[PDB]
CSV table of C-alpha atoms (C1' of nucleotides) and ligand atoms in Angstrom, one decimal:
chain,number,residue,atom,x,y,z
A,1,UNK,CA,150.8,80.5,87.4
A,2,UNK,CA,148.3,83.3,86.2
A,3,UNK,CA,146.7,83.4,89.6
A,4,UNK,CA,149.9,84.1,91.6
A,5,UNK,CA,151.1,86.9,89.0
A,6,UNK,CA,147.8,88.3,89.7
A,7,UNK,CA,148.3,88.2,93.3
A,8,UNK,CA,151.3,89.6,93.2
A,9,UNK,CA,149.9,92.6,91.3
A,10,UNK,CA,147.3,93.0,94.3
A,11,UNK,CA,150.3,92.5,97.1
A,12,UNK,CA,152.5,95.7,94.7
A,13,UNK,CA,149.4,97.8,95.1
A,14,UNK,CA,149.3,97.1,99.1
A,15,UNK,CA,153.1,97.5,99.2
A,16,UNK,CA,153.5,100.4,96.9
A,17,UNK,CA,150.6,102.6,97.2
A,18,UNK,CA,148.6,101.2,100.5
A,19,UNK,CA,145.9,100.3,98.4
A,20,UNK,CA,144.5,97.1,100.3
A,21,UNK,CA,141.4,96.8,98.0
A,22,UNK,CA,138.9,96.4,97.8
A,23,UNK,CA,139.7,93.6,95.2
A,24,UNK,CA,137.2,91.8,93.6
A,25,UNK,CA,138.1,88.1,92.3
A,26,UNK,CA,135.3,86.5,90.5
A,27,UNK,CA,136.2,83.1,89.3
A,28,UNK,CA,134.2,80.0,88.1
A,29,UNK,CA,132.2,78.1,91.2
A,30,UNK,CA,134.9,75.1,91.4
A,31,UNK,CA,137.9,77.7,91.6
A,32,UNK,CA,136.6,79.3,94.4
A,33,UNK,CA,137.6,77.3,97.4
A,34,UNK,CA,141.1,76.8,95.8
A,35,UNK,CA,141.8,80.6,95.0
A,36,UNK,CA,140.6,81.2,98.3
A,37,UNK,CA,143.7,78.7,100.0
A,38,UNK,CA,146.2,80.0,97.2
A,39,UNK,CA,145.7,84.1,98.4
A,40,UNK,CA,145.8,82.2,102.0
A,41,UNK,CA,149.0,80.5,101.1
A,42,UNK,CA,151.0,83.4,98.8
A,43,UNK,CA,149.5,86.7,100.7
A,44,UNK,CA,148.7,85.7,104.3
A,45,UNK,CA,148.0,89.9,105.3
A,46,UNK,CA,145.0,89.8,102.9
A,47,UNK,CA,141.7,89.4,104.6
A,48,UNK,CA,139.6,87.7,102.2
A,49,UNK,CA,135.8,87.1,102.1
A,50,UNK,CA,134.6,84.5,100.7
A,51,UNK,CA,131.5,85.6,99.2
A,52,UNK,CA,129.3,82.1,98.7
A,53,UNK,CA,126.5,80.6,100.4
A,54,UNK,CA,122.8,80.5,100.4
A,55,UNK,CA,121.4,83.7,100.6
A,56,UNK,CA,120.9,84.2,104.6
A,57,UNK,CA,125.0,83.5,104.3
A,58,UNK,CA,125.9,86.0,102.0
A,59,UNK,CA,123.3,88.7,103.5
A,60,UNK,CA,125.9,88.1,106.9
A,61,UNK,CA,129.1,88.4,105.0
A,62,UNK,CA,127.5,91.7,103.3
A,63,UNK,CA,127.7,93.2,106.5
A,64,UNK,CA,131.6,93.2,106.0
A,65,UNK,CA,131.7,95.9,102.8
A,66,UNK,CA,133.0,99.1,103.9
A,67,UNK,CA,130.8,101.7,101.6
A,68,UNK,CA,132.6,105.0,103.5
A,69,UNK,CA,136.7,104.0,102.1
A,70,UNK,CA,137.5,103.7,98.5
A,71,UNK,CA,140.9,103.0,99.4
B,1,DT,C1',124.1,85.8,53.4
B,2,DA,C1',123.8,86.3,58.0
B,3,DG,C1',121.4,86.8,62.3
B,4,DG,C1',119.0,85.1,65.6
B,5,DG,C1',115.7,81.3,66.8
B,6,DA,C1',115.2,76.3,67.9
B,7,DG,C1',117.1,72.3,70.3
B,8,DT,C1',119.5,70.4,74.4
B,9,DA,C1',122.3,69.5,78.3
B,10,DA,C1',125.4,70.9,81.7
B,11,DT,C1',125.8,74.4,85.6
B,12,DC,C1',124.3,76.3,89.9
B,13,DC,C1',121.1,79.1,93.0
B,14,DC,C1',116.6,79.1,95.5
B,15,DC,C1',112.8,76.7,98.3
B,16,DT,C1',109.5,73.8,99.2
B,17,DT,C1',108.6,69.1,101.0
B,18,DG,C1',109.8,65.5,104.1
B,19,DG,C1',112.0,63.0,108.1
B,20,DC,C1',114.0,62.8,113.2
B,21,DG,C1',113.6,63.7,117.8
B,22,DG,C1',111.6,65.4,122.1
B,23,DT,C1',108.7,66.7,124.8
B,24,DT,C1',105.0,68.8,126.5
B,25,DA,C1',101.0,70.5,126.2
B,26,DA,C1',96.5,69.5,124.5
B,27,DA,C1',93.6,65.8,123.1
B,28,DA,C1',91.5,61.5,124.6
B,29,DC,C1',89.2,58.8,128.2
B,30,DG,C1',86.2,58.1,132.7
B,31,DC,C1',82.4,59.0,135.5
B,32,DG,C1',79.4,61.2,138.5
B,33,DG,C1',75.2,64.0,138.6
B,34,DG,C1',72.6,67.6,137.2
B,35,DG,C1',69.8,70.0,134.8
B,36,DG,C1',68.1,70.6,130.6
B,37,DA,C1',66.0,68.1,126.8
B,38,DC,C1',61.5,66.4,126.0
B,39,DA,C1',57.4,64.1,126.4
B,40,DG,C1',52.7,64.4,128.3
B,41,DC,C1',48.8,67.4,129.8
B,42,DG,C1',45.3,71.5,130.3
B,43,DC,C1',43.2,75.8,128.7
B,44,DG,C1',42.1,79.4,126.3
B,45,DT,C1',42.5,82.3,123.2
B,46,DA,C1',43.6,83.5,119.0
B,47,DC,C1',43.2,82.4,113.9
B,48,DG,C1',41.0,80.1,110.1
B,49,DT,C1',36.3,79.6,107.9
B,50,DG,C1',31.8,81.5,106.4
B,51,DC,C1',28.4,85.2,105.0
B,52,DG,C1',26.7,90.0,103.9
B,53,DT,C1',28.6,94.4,102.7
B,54,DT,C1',31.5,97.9,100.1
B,55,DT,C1',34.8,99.4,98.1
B,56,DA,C1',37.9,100.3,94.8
B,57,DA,C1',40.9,97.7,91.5
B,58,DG,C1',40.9,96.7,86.7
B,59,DC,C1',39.3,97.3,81.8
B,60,DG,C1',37.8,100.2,77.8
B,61,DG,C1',38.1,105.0,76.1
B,62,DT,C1',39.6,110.2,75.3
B,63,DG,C1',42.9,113.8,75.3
B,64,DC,C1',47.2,116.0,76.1
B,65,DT,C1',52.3,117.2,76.3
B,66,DA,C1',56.3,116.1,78.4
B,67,DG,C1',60.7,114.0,77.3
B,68,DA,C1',62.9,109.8,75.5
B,69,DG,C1',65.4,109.0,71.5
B,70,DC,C1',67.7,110.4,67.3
B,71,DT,C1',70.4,113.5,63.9
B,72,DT,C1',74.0,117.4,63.2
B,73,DG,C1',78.0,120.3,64.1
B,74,DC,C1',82.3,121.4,66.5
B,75,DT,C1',85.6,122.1,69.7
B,76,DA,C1',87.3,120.8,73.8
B,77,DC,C1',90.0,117.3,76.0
B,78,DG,C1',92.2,113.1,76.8
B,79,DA,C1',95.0,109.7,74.2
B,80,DC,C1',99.8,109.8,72.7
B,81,DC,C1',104.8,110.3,73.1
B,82,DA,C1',109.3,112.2,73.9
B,83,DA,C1',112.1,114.6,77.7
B,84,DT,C1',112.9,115.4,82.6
B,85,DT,C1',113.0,114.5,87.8
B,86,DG,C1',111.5,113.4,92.2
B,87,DA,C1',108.2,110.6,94.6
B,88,DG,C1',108.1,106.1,96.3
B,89,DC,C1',110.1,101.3,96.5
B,90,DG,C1',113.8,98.0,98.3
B,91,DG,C1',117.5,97.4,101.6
B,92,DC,C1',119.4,98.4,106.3
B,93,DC,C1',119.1,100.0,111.2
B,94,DT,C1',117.6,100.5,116.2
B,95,DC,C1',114.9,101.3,120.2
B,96,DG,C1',110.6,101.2,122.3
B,97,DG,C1',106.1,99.2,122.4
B,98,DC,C1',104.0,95.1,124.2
B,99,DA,C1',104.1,90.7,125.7
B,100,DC,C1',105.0,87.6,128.8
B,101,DC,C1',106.0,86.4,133.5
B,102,DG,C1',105.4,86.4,138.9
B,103,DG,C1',103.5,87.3,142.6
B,104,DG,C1',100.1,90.1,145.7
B,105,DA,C1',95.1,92.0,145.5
B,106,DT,C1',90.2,92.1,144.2
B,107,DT,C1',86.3,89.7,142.2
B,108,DC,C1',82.9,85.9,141.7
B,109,DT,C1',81.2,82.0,142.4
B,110,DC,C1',78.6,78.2,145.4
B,111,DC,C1',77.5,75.9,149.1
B,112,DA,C1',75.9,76.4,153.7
C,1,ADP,N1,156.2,81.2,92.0
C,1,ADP,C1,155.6,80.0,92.4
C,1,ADP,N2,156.1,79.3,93.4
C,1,ADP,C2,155.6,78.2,93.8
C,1,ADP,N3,154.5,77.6,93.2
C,1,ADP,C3,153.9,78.2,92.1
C,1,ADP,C4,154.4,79.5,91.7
C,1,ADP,N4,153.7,79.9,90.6
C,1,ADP,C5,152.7,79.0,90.4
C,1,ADP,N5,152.8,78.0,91.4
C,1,ADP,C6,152.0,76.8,91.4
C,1,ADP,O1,151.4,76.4,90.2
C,1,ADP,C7,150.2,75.7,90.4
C,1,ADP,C8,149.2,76.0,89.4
C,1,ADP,O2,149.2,77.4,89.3
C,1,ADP,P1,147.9,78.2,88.9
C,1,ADP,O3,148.2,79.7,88.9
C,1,ADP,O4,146.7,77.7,89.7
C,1,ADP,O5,147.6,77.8,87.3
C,1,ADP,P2,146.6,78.7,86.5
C,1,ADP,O6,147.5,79.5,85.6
C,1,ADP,O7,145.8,77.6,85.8
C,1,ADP,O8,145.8,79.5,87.5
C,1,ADP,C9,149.8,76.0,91.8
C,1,ADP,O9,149.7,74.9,92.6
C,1,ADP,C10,150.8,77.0,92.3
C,1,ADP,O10,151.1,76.8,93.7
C,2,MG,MG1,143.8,80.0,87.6
DNA sequence: TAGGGAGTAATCCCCTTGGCGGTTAAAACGCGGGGGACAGCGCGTACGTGCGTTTAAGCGGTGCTAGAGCTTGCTACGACCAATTGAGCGGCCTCGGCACCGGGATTCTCCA
């Protein structure tokens, strides 16, 4: 499991230094919908946007990015 | 000898076309009547034809000088490019202009 390792490394930074992203996943097109349920599944306190859609749907999720945090 | 172009097919985002459903407003259909199209008529005056006059346009001829058209010389200026930045484009935001509605007031029509 490379993806849960992974996750784990995100959930440590959360834990250990209150760094709750942002975090960006890219993956290929047919991972998307299962990466999305495996974060849901191993790290239920991480919000998660799933960034995919026609254009109109991703210009509404971009609404979402905090510009003014870095942490 | 190697790099990058040619071939090709899978991958995935963008976007234009087409269908379904309603519903609703605009196109289609009817018909009376009116008034405007249009033919037919009278007159008169205004425009084409003709003749004598004149006027000046057009052709042949002379003389002049301006200025179009060409050659020469040079330097000013706009093409050129490398370095620098800030004006102006693309994305995001919000509030106020304007439209759309409803109902009461003034205008305009048409028949008496
Ligand atoms: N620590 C774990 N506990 C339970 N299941 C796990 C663990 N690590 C991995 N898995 C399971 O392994 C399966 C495949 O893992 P995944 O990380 O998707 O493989 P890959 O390395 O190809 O991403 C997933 O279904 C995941 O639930
Ligand atoms: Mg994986």
């Amino acid at each position: 499991g490379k993806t849960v390792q992974s996750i784990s490394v995100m959930a440590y930074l959360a834990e250990r230094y209150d760094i709750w992203g942002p975090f960006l996943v890219v993956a290929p097109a047919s991972t998307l919908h299962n990466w999305q349920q495996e974060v849901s599944k191993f790290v239920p306190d991480f919000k998660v946007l799933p960034y995919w859609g026609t254009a109109a749907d991703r210009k509404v999720l971009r609404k979402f990015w905090d510009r003014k945090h870095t942490t």
